[PDB]
Design a protein around this ligand. Structure first.
Ligand SMILES: CC[C@@H](C(=O)OC)[C@@H]1N=C(c2ccc(Cl)cc2)c2c(sc(C)c2C)-n2c(C)nnc21
Length: 110
């Protein structure tokens, strides 16, 4: 079973995956498929890929040791997006909007 802080984190994850954020969260649902997107240098630039399905798998299987490990993975997912893409890219605006949800909810962790 999950700790109280990791239960709060699981609630954040549920919110990030919910329909109310779907219009900007959907790029982050699954691992970036660099070959399908035709982005041949993605894994040259991004050393440690991350996405919400991976965070969800780790949460369900109780892989996270604590809330800070969860937060590191979520921030890594957003960081990779910023690292690869230019600042005016549509996916960067989606990432910042979803990250604002995460950061506000994470700051309210009891
Ligand atoms: C791989 C580098 C980016 C790119 O393809 O170069 C233009 C890429 N962009 C898109 C993207 C493009 C436009 C919109 Cl509106 C939404 C998403 C995207 C993902 S995952 C996904 C299923 C998609 C459609 N992605 C994440 C996450 N980080 N970078 C990206």
């Amino acid at each position: 079973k999950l700790s109280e802080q990791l239960k709060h984190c699981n609630g954040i994850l549920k919110e990030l995956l919910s329909k109310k954020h779907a219009a900007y969260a959907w790029p982050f649902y699954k691992p970036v498929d660099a070959s399908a997107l035709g982005v041949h240098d993605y894994h040259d630039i991004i050393k440690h890929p991350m996405d919400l399905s991976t965070v969800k798998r780790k949460m369900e299987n109780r892989d996270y040791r604590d809330a800070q490990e969860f937060a590191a993975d979520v921030r890594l997912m957003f960081s990779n997006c910023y690292k690869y893409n230019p600042p005016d890219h549509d996916v960067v605006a989606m990432a910042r909007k979803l990250q604002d949800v995460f950061e506000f909810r994470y700051a309210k962790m009891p």
